[PDB]
Design a protein around this nucleic acid. Sequence first.
DNA 1: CGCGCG
DNA 2: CGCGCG
Lengths: 70, 70
Amino acid sequence: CTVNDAEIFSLVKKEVLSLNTNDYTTAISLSNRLKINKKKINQQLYKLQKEDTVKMVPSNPPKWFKNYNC
Amino acid sequence: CTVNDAEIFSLVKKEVLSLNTNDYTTAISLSNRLKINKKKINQQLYKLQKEDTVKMVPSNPPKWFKNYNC
DNA sequence: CGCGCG
DNA sequence: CGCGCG
């Protein structure tokens, strides 16, 4: 009856996988689309990087790329 | 019914003002010596630094010395 | 303001 | 793990 963070994780993963290898996005942009708090978006983005689905580039703010192996 | 920001500020300010000239303390130490969450301790420490009561030296964890004015 | 942090 | 961030 409850959808913890897993549904957020799934929404974010689906979004990043839709990116072109050459494109990138940010937490603020993602938060804006999925209408979710940037904090929630970040909690998933960093977890997703641990799974190698996305790659973060320490820009200001960080830019997120889909793993090019995809 | 709860010790608020302003009140924790006073508690932290007193501990820091009781340090000898060149000795420091850390947020976790104050957290332990007192019965307050580390986050709440740091919230006060950085404000105390803005007020020139304490001085922070980066390290892990950050060291907090009494400002020489005191 | 980069912050994800338990 | 540095985090204080409203």
